Amino acid sequence: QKLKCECQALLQVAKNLFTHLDDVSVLLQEIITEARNLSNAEICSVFLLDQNELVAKVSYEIRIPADQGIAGHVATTGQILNIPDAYRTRNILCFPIKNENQEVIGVAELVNKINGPWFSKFDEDLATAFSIYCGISIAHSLLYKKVNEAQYRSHLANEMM
Amino acid sequence: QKLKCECQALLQVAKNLFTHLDDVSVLLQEIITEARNLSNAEICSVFLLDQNELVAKVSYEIRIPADQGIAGHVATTGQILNIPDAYRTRNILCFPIKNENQEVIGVAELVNKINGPWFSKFDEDLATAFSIYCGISIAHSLLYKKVNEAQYRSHLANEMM
Amino acid sequence: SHMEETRELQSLAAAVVPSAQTLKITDFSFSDFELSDLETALCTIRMFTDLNLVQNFQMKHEVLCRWILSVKKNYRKNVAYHNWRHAFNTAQCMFAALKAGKIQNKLTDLEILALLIAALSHDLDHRGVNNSYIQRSEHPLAQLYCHSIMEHHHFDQCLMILNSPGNQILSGLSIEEYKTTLKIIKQAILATDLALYIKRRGEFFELIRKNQFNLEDPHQKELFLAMLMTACDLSAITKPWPIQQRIAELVATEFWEQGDLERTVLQQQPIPMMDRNKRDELPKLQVGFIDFVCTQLYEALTHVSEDCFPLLDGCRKNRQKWQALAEQ
Amino acid sequence: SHMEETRELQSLAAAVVPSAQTLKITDFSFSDFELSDLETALCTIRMFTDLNLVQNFQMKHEVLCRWILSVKKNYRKNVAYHNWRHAFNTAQCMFAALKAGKIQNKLTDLEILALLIAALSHDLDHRGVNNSYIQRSEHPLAQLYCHSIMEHHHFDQCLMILNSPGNQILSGLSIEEYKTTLKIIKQAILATDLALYIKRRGEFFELIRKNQFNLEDPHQKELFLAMLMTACDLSAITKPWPIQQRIAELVATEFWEQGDLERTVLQQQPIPMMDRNKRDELPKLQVGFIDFVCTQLYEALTHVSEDCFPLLDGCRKNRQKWQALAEQ
Amino acid sequence: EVQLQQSGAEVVRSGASVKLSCTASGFNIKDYYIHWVKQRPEKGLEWIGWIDPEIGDTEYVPKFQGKATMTADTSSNTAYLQLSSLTSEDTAVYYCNAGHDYDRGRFPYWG
Amino acid sequence: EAFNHLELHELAQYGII
Amino acid sequence: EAFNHLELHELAQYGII
Numbered sequence A, B: 001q002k003l004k005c006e007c008q009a010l011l012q013v014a015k016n017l018f019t020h021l022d023d024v025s026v027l028l029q030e031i032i033t034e035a036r037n038l039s040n041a042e043i044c045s046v047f048l049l050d051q052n053e054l055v056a057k058v059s060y061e062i063r064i065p066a067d068q069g070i071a072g073h074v075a076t077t078g079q080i081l082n083i084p085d086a087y088r089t090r091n092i093l094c095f096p097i098k099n100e101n102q103e104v105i106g107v108a109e110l111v112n113k114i115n116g117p118w119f120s121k122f123d124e125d126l127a128t129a130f131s132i133y134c135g136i137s138i139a140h141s142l143l144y145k146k147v148n149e150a151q152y153r154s155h156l157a158n159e160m161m
Numbered sequence C, D: 001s002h003m004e005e006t007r008e009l010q011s012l013a014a015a016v017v018p019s020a021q022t023l024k025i026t027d028f029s030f031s032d033f034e035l036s037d038l039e040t041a042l043c044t045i046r047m048f049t050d051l052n053l054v055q056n057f058q059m060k061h062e063v064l065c066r067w068i069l070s071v072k073k074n075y076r077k078n079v080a081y082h083n084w085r086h087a088f089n090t091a092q093c094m095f096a097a098l099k100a101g102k103i104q105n106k107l108t109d110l111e112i113l114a115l116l117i118a119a120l121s122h123d124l125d126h127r128g129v130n131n132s133y134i135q136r137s138e139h140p141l142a143q144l145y146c147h148s149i150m151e152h153h154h155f156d157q158c159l160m161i162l163n164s165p166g167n168q169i170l171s172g173l174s175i176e177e178y179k180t181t182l183k184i185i186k187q188a189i190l191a192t193d194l195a196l197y198i199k200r201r202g203e204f205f206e207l208i209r210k211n212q213f214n215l216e217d218p219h220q221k222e223l224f225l226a227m228l229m230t231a232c233d234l235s236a237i238t239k240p241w242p243i244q245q246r247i248a249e250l251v252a253t254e255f256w257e258q259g260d261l262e263r264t265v266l267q268q269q270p271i272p273m274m275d276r277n278k279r280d281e282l283p284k285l286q287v288g289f290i291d292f293v294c295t296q297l298y299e300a301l302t303h304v305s306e307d308c309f310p311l312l313d314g315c316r317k318n319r320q321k322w323q324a325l326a327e328q
Numbered sequence E: 001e002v003q004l005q006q007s008g009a010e011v012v013r014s015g016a017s018v019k020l021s022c023t024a025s026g027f028n029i030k031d032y033y034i035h036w037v038k039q040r041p042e043k044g045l046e047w048i049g050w051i052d053p054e055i056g057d058t059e060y061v062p063k064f065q066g067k068a069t070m071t072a073d074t075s076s077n078t079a080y081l082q083l084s085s086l087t088s089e090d091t092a093v094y095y096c097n098a099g100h101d102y103d104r105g106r107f108p109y110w111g
Numbered sequence F, G: 001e002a003f004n005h006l007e008l009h010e011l012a013q014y015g016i017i
């Protein structure tokens, strides 16, 4: 009954992240909201690998080394990381994003469980499940910005002729 | 058990039509394949309203009046249509597409049931279910072609300067 | 028939006019081959719009649309090159000239409006035959008009349409404005007579040559306006080879079609250029014409405006390819 | 320091160079304000590439990249206007001139290569001060070189870099080619001395005036090549107002910075143009300069090539706005 | 219907000449190119050339220069083929056919 | 349409006059 | 850098010479 329920859940969320491929910024937000209710986190932050560093702008912009701290490790290693006690902190569930291959393309971390000591070791396969849709959507979402950006500059020039 | 099954079904198909917003042509194909297995039709054809006429190019191009025949009616009326006997024909389940509003934007018809006399009056709510994802996807899929087309012409010119 | 016409107005006077960028009409290298009829009309509206003609002269979207459509339907379909797509390709050249070539900043709003309206209608009801023929065949049009026969007719038509009801795109002009606009339009259309281009260009080529040419001079200007008309009227010759290729195919046919009439009703021998049999002497005939009529002119036009060079470039570039061909 | 430099080459010599269309470098109305450092370098590569320089002279992606980077790092950051973005904006103008202005079709591959390399390095190691100052302050550079002091230095630098290991972007040239390329490059860079522009332009303005100017003539050409250098060297003045606005802000500061030195180490009074206190007489000083130095030249350039008019248009368009301002 | 009617068979002496006719009915030859093609016994058809009856312009393939002479007359709608200095090798069936002057080479009508 | 007699041939061989 | 003496003022008031 639960298993069946975390799909309709995901079915939902899949259909919500895919209605924002338009805006990597709105999309990036959705991923956060959704990621927070799905796992029931106090807070989620999302980092998008920018070459050799993590950028979770999430509004300001926050750079940092891609291999530094929690985010950096998980990003480096490409494998989830669960924390019971981190030592209003407490716990942290942090997971990779990776693209079509398995190239971690971003990273997200949830802090503190609501109604709980930590993250259900089920809150991981569910996070991994979600995390496929985040990588699928971020990947295309960025790949679509690149075009629109370029293609725009292309005409800024052409209206010049 | 069945109800739960026609969702994972749709969950699937939602995620397959949305991985082809790139190509209204591939997408248009997907809609056909998927629409045929979901209902289990011998054949599906899909018409996209082109102003005052139906164009189910589905490879050649087939125009025809938007209000003519089965397709035309359903397209005109904006409401499904089930046929037991049509008189290797037999039956025909034909349904509208409509956009964000309820503007029928295309139409699809399935012919002849496999293992059956006709179309389960369940094969209708399932078709309507699907048909939401077809309208959602076609709508954006076309709206994305329009840009890429234009934006291209924009630079064909700009590379001229 | 009247029915398809009238829905055509419905659909047109309600569609969004895309940007000039979108339409690539700002380009000297522009082509219509792939546009629909409805699209061309749309470009036209964008033209008027982006030249500020629409706002500065209180044009109603409704009216302009009718008018445009009217001009469209008054070009003959059966006519090989001198159909609507010629009037359109000319006006787009004209438009490109004012924008990218940067000439707008050199002349008045009354002049810009007149050039555009003229460019669009400079060949109305052209029946696929030159002034020379109609004269030699004693067409009643030759009995009516003296010199520049066809060009007088093209104008008679332009004006007939502007006086049509729901086509008065000029309705917004003061009587004085209207009065002089029409004057300029008459001058523009007549200027597209190749004979006048020849009998006048010498004058203009010298003021250029002698670094004396100057717009401010009222007369020097209106001469130039003539030259500009010609410039756009045969801009086709400044197109990318694949285009020049194909549009030269139409001029070809239309000529040959006249050549047939010359020996069938007139019982004379056509000039080689319209002698269907001599299709293999096309390229040199093209070369000689480009030399005689064209390079000369587009050179001048660039001295007047540098940004108009693409025209000169594309011209000699085609001359290059015809010459090669002429040598098989 | 050496470390950031070297990774900069890694990242650069492995990124995809976007198309010229994408980069809008084909535009006379182009701006760099929003580009990164890495992006500018990329444009440069696209420049060399689309001028066929890369293929016709067997350049290795590796080498070109190093070279470009080297030039970049040899412009002074602390210097207000005469930094890398100036060399870059010049070369892009130069590039735009050859393409959209259509000049490529008028000169050799050896000449195009030389112009580009020259445009990029015409101000190397510029220390934010004019020839006049360095002369009057008895800089050792004045003891070394006779006339066109700075410009001789800019070249000394250009050449030092081309002889650097893994920077020989010319390595592919026959010794004869190399030998004459360098000659032209020397001529180009020196030509960006405003004093030579003045002491030579008269000659050139007449051949234009008298409709006598002709490229074919070897000498007439190399003169024009000088004029073309100047044309791009101060193309900034032909930019959209918002850009011209801001780049005039840098020239401003750099001048004023020199003005300070003039009364602090030299104990002389600076010309008003570099007299920080007189910042309110900028616009008229701009006007007078545009009149004296610019319009004159861009006019000429259009007579030579019409498609180069946008430069003239943008120039007088800014003159317009400065004049207004000068009248508060 | 559209028809091309040719003259009857001729038995001629070597060295002589013969003139063949091809008459159009149901249509006018003016806007067509009239072509002639030869067919030798046990051999394929070989094109001789065409005439543009409107202007009288003719084009012959090199093997028939000075052998064949084509003429036409649009008022009587008849085209002619004159063959001179005949030899054994000229024995064949001769066809006239027609195609639109603006057409590349389709032969919709044959005598 | 009266032009110099030397011009006349070129004028005519193109569609002018 | 020797120019006509009439030119000299304009030349100098701009950064030239």
Ligand SMILES: CC(C)Cn1c(=O)n(C)c(=O)c2nc[nH]c21
Binding pocket: C162, C163, C168, C169, C170, C171, C172, C173, C174, C175, C178, C179
């Ligand atoms: C008769 C004419 C002077 C009056 N007049 C006019 O003033 N405008 C502005 C028109 O558009 C127009 N059309 C026909 N007559 C017109």
Ligand SMILES: CC(C)Cn1c(=O)n(C)c(=O)c2nc[nH]c21
Binding pocket: C233, C234, C235, C236, C237, C248, C251, C286, C289, F015
């Ligand atoms: C009036 C027109 C047929 C004259 N004209 C022309 O416009 N183009 C574009 C040609 O290429 C051409 N060649 C011969 N006449 C020509």
Ligand SMILES: CC(C)Cn1c(=O)n(C)c(=O)c2nc[nH]c21
Binding pocket: D162, D163, D168, D169, D170, D171, D172, D173, D174, D175, D178, D179
């Ligand atoms: C010393 C010089 C003539 C030889 N030479 C040369 O031929 N090419 C092609 C270069 O790029 C180069 N760079 C330094 N010397 C060079």
Ligand SMILES: CC(C)Cn1c(=O)n(C)c(=O)c2nc[nH]c21
Binding pocket: D233, D234, D235, D236, D237, D248, D251, D286, D289, G015
């Ligand atoms: C050498 C340079 C500072 C001369 N220069 C220039 O290039 N631009 C673009 C100006 O606007 C300007 N104004 C005075 N000097 C100027």
